[PDB]
Design a protein around this ligand. Structure first.
Ligand SMILES: N#Cc1cccnc1N1CCN(C(=O)c2cccc(Cc3n[nH]c(=O)c4ccccc34)c2)CC1
Ligand SMILES: [Zn+2]
Length: 208
């Protein structure tokens, strides 16, 4: 469907709120930066608002259904999503049929989503230099509206095909000797809208 990308100005409070969420949710991973690279900050290049009529209709229709089922609590959250398929998502929307557990995954930590931008485990890194820690190539991630409804809380790895009865999402919570970062899972593509398209670089730490 026909998508319009609206550029946000760095002086706008909306652009600043998105950047602040992205910068403040960075964590150090157990990985040592193997999947996403070594950095403590991003360089934000562009923040674009995604406008798609058909995707907004599917999203709003699903949100109303979830709110009705969950005593008027749709429990919407803004969460990050990193993937090599950003172009398909902003035009056709999120699709659970591509998941390959089996649901659509989001993170509350931008650094978690950054590990998936080039593929699982960071794939082979950027197309040009084949570098998972590339400081040059422009990466993209989404900051999405996610309809969570009633969330089912667990510590184990999410090995479910659908949300349990009475629930609309699954949350994998960090625990000592378990997950390092929280994972948010939905099983219907209509329960996420790709609101913001963020273009950025990971920054190389200063030399002592
Ligand atoms: N839609 C569509 C689509 C179209 C064309 C091709 N692949 C499409 N997929 C692949 C499937 N999907 C997923 O979300 C997924 C499924 C399994 C694993 C991951 C990894 C993942 N990634 N990113 C994140 O921020 C994150 C955050 C927390 C945990 C794990 C993760 C993600 C949905 C998107
Ligand atoms: Zn590169």
């Amino acid at each position: 469907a026909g998508t319009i990308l609206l550029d946000l100005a760095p002086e706008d409070k909306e652009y600043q709120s998105v950047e602040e969420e992205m910068q403040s949710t960075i964590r150090e991973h157990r990985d040592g930066g193997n999947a996403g690279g070594i950095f403590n900050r991003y360089n934000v290049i562009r923040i674009q608002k995604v406008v798609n009529k058909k995707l907004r209709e599917r999203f709003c229709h699903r949100q109303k259904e979830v709110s009705e089922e969950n005593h008027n609590h749709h429990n919407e959250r803004m969460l990050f999503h990193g993937s090599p398929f950003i172009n398909a998502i902003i035009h056709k929307g999120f699709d659970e049929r591509h998941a390959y557990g089996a649901g659509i995954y989001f993170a509350e930590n931008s650094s978690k989503s950054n590990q998936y931008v080039y593929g699982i485990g960071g794939g082979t890194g950027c197309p040009t230099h084949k570098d998972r820690s590339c400081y040059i190539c422009h990466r993209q991630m989404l900051f999405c509206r996610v309809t969570l409804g009633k969330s089912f809380l667990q510590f184990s790895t999410i090995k479910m095909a659908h949300a349990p009865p009475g629930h609309h999402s699954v949350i994998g919570r960090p625990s000592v000797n378990g997950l390092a970062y929280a994972e948010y899972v939905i099983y219907r593509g209509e329960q996420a809208y790709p609101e913001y398209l963020i273009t950025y670089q990971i920054m190389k730490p200063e030399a002592p």
